[PDB]
Design a protein around this ligand. Structure first.
Ligand SMILES: N[C@@H](Cc1ccccc1)[C@H](O)CNS(=O)(=O)c1ccc2ccccc2c1
Ligand code: NA
Lengths: 10, 251, 29
């Protein structure tokens, strides 16, 4: 449901 | 927020979203009180009866947001947590007494038109503004009904008399809580709802024109029910614990 | 309290009012 956030944050 | 409206842009620049890494989802709201400290509700992090117990690495904070679900390129800043502190006398067994927690971010977030800290009150600000009938403001991306908002939502709600709060519920109310909301007679409506917890109840001082965080969205029994009110952590009553945490562990 | 706390860049800082803050002020009798 949420837009994918940059993977640098994950 | 139930019966609120869309926020304007940069209207709540201290609003923080607590966001779960995996699955990717909104956990709660929160507020920015300085460039490295975010304030939220303890139950957003720890609530054992629902098997809730997040550590730092489960969580991210997202600051500068307006859209709920969009990744707001060049506007928002996503931050990792260094350490979480939950009030040592937070009462999750009984009544959510002392529903407060601090999160320290790994690096300073840069302020912008969309990112700016809220004030914490002093004794005089609290004594002056925390009065039955005086209105504050609640913001969040939580449910629109007891479905979900495209953008940050806002509602202004009056502080309610201590007896009325207590007479609305079977839960034991402490001096570390206040309730706010319209009465059934009052005609108007509105409430925090699921997903709004941790977020700020703020007031604008008529004395220095500054926004102060008077409450933290804590709990209710349903959302926007007639004869029922939203309960908020009383921020000033817990300010020494706040100052202590920040002074001991901050830089 | 932080020096510049609680003053919003797109409102207080430019002396703009938001749509409903007057409701708050009117409540502070
Ligand atoms: N949005 C939630 C907030 C919440 C979640 C989990 C734990 C506490 C609070 C609802 O307001 C919860 N509503 S509730 O389930 O009726 C409730 C209300 C008061 C409570 C007081 C102490 C402990 C649990 C509570 C649950
Ligand atoms: Na109500």
């Amino acid at each position: 449901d949420f837009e994918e956030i940059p993977e640098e944050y994950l | 927020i139930v019966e609120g409206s869309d926020a304007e842009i940069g209207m709540s620049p201290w609003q923080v979203m607590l966001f779960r890494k995996s699955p990717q989802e909104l956990l709660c709201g929160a507020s920015l009180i300085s460039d490295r400290w975010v304030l939220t509700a303890a139950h957003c992090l720890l609530y054992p009866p629902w098997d809730k117990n997040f550590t730092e690495n489960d969580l991210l904070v997202r600051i500068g947001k307006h859209s709920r679900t969009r990744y707001e390129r060049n506007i928002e800043k996503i931050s990792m947590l260094e350490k979480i502190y939950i009030h040592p006398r937070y009462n999750w067994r009984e009544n959510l007494d002392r529903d407060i927690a601090l999160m320290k971010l790994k690096k300073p977030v840069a302020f912008s038109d969309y990112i700016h800290p809220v004030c914490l009150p002093d004794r005089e600000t609290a004594a002056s503004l925390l009065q039955a009938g005086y209105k504050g403001r609640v913001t969040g991306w939580g449910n629109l009904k007891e479905g979900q908002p495209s953008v940050l939502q806002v509602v202004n709600l009056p502080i309610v008399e201590r007896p009325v709060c207590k007479d609305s519920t079977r839960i034991r109310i402490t001096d570390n809580m206040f309730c706010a909301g319209y009465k059934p007679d009052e005609g108007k409506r509105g409430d925090a709802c699921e997903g709004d917890s941790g977020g700020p109840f703020v007031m604008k001082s008529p004395f220095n024109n500054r926004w102060y965080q008077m409450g933290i969205v804590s709990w209710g029994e349903g959302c926007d029910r007639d004869g029922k009110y939203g309960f908020y952590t009383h921020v000033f009553r817990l300010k020494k614990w706040i100052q202590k945490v920040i002074d001991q562990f901050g830089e | 309290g932080e020096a510049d706390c609680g003053l919003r860049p797109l409102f207080e800082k430019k002396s703009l009012e938001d749509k409903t803050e007057r409701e708050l002020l009117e409540s502070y009798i």
